[PDB]
Design a protein around this nucleic acid. Sequence first.
RNA 1: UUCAUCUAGACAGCCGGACGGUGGCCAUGGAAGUCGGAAUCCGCUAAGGAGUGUGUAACAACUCACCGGCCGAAUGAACUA
Lengths: 816, 197, 158
Amino acid sequence: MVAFTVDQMRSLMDKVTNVRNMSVIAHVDHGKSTLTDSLVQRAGKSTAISLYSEMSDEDVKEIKQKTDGNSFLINLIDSPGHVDFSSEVTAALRVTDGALVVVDTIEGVCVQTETVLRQALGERIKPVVVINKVDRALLELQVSKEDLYQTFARTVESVNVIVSTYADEVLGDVQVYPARGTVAFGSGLHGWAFTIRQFATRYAKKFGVDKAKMMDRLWGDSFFNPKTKKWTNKDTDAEGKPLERAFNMFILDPIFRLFTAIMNFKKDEIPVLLEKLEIVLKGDEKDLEGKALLKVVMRKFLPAADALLEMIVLHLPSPVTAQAYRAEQLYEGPADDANCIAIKNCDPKADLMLYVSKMVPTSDKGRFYAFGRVFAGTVKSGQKVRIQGPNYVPGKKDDLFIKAIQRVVLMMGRFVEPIDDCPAGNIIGLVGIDQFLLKTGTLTTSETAHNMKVMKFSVSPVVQVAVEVKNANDLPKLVEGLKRLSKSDPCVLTYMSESGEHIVAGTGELHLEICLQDLEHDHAGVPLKISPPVVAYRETVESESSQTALSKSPNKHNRIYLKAEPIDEEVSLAIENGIINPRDDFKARARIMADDYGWDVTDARKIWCFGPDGNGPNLVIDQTKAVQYLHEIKDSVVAAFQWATKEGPIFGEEMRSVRVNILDVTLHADAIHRGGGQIIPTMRRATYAGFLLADPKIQEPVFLVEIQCPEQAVGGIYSVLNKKRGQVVSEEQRPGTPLFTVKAYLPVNESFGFTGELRQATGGQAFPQMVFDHWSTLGSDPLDPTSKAGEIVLAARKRHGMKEEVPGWQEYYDKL
Amino acid sequence: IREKKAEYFAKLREYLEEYKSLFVVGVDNVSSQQMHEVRKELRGRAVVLMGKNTMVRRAIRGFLSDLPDFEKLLPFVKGNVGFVFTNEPLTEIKNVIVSNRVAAPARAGAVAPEDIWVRAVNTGMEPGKTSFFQALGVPTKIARGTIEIVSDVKVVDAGNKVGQSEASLLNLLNISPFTFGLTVVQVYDNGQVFPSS
Amino acid sequence: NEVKYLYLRAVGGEVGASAALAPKIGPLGLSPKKVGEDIAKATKEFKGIKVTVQLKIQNRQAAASVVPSASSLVITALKEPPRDRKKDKNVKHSGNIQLDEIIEIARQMRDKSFGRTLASVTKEILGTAQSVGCRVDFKNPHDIIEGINAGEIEIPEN
RNA sequence: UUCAUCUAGACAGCCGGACGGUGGCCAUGGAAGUCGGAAUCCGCUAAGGAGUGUGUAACAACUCACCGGCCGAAUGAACUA
Ligand SMILES: CO[C@H]1[C@@H](O)[C@H](O)[C@H](OC[C@@]23C[C@@H]4[C@H](C)CC[C@H]4[C@@]4(C=O)C[C@@H]2C[C@H](C(C)C)[C@@]34C(=O)O)O[C@@H]1C
Ligand SMILES: Nc1nc2c(ncn2[C@@H]2O[C@H](COP(=O)(O)OP(=O)(O)O)[C@@H](O)[C@H]2O)c(=O)[nH]1
Ligand SMILES: [Mg+2]
Ligand SMILES: [Mg+2]
């Protein structure tokens, strides 16, 4: 629309029964943006674009939705086909109600078509299928008339397999069929498309045959049987010379004769067909060769922009009818609350329900209009609105802000239209936020309005790359750039690794490379270098400190005897989730530690500190007998344990599951000789000595990875996992669907490029998600530089600037 | 080998002189499980003996010394055949042998003896099997969450052998178009041969 | 709701693994969970051993029952005193199974088996037991088998 | 040179079968002949390996050992120089 009227879009939008909120989903290169361009052709990242289509009485009555009027407004989202952007298509699906499935006739139903339909049918969206690039089969594959029909049947059957498998058992009849008008065929590039329902109208104006019965006769095993004028339902042998079907002979035949004549330059035959099909010409189209006369005649003979929007208006649901069965799906609250019911009604006078999903940039750094869908009530520019956070719970204090909107705006083709207000059930953006909503959330008015579901998406950030600037002084520009990228792109994840490294996380290599390109040039504006992130390890023991560790103070008046213990993992897991907490009281925390974990009760009471940081998974035990001045050096001992458990003695990493049993202490009588300067160094060296005799080992982080993959591609999961030392844990199958779910332990060390390896091995059908689970102890010695665990230590030391070898137990130990 | 070979001679000799009736059965395309089933049925009543066509002929030709009449057996000993020996009511013995017919599953490469069809039916198979139908070009719809063929398709034409794609779909739907079982070419008893009919 | 017939091998006295039956049963409608305990009800006696279980599913009702199988019956006849799952690899079970038990085992299989007499089935099960690794009457199953051959361990043909 | 097969039909070739107990014992997340360790059984047998390969996530499905149908007189292997 070329600036029809600012009020006119507002006025048409007021009607909530004549509006269609749909998103176009397809495979990566199946022509979805070209079809969308052809839909906006007659109207004079994914920003919503709106379409206006009139209608007449006969075809508006043939609509199974509560509606009144003759004009319709269509809300269109250009969803991305790439699996690396399979999160913003989920954002589109939440904000829309219909799905236009663009399908290739050549490639058929591809992997990403499989994925997007699974997303749409999971979100309870009715799909409508359009088969594009039909011109390619006509000019490249040279299908004559029946091969094209058979390809269409295979395409429709393939889509319905997806639909029948993944359609929830609340609608059932969401299957797609050309006969009902739910499948369209055309060439978006040339701007022509059709539906058999549209074609059934074209012949009715001349034959007078009924249109309701042409649906099941223009498709399938249905033959006109010419020379007899009897619509047979089977070949019958045609008394010899079996004949063609109605689809080929009535729908595809007029198309093919036009193609054959126009492409073969039958200048005497082109006007004959054109005058038969009541087409319109121009003042320069008569002098035209092939490949351009074909485009103009096809767009005029069968306009894609006309067939497609009528396709949306008939079958794609309106907001008022889908929220009926969808409200309980987006609202995690009960089904019996006024706010839940107001969603189903889609009444514009109840409490506000606006789900913000996107932050649309403003060509200004940091303004980021808040794109979303209004669900209940009417939003007004300048009204107090309660913003809710993704983790908001109404019971207690949470991410609730009491700000107001500056301006409600309409999205269009990269222009912003301010309106005073907007009814429920449409697409609206808000100005005055992105200082109050990080990624998503809802905007409400009620005090009992729980935020709706978190808009789960099928992908997750699995590609990890460390980032840092070549220029040291340019650090804050990068972190400013990182924070701006975290809010522009909804699926990118920025955080700090445990080795003090900036990590950018993406869905796949292509999406991550897009975001990293934004960092280098657009967001940060500073040139940075990208490396695999540094894996943070832990240091543990697997023995009992074969001989006692002995260390002397610098003054030699103090000696520490201790030993190391390989603390059980279950006790170690207990500490870090709060079961064994230092701030608990001794002799009670000891009882839980002793009775419920198999430890000795006496050791359980005699706790000095946890390491590192005072609450870590490492322990120091007072195994000493009666001794004079332990209590005055207790503070120094725990400080050294904090030092020793923060920087281990192998390559300087945190200790884990290490217990220090202090067998004996010999201290000088005078406090000035057993001060911190004498005990802190000697305990750390004794701990370092004790660690190095109890078979030191290093622990690597292990990801818990779960992958959803179809049956045909499950083999790639095991092949990559068994090559990357992955340990398969469990398998399962979803009810009715063929989707496998594989749970496995993939070590973080061998976890960079795993998703790229996995996608290639499974043909892109595998969807992995990873989260840190636990630490696994490597069996090989980390002091043997030629061992599998000793190469990590040697590599880490060089990167830190330390020496190549590890200081042996001979250091940190004094001979006595 | 010869001692093993002569042992079969002894077994054949014993049967020939202890079972007045013997059934010459053509065992073409007959599986080994089917053979096991037939022997179980005929157990007690009768004993089935197979062998090498040349081996039995030499055995019979030699045995003619004691038992001349057996000459007439020889000319009909050709092709894949076996001998069911009995002293029982042959008609019942004949019925059991020729009624154990078991429908052999459709197999890729077998010449089709008629026009195999996939008729419009509710196959009952879950929708993840449409590829098999789509492979053969069979139009299908998903009615009641299952594959429903829309229209008659002739999956294999008469004469042309069952292709691998053809067979795979057929074995899913259990449309085995050829059945095999032990057929009888001759009946010998009371020192006389005659056809089963 | 039909004659649909499934054959799953499950460790006795325990519900089958989700990946073992849930994909197969459930496409008809029956939730796996109560089917899972159905095998447990059948397998109580056969607990601790991977026994075959026939499933006669009809009207959302799975008839779970242990299918007599050579390996299963032989081991459960010895009753296999509690086998520590964490004991070691190559779990060994030989004990000493009597001739009375094995011929009784052969009777449960004689229906399905393809032996002529009972002696054929009895030596068959002994061949099965050798693979299982048992000790029939303090003797190798093969030795008993050849003993049956040269008229030493007779078999009641009843 | 030696050892074998062969008119009681050898080798090659074409075609048919290649089973039952049994998903043999196991661990393995899964392993049903075919990732593996150990065990190389019995029945029906003209004959079939607790399986020579393809294949499966595992089944499935092909294939070959083994035996047959055709043919009809020779043939195979390992060595030596
Ligand atoms: C949404 O993504 C989440 C997690 O789901 C994911 O597991 C990822 O893992 C990061 C790591 C977390 C580990 C623990 C905190 C201890 C050690 C940490 C790691 C190694 O150094 C292991 C994974 C991988 C990261 C290193 C290699 C950079 C970790 C890190 O952040 O340092 O963390 C992000 C924030
Ligand atoms: N022949 C033909 N080519 C098409 C058609 N639609 C798209 N294409 C091709 O696809 C390319 C870009 O398609 P596009 O719409 O951007 O793909 P998208 O990623 O799905 O949006 C163009 O170069 C076209 O050649 C069509 O209908 N016919
Ligand atoms: Mg595009
Ligand atoms: Mg395997």
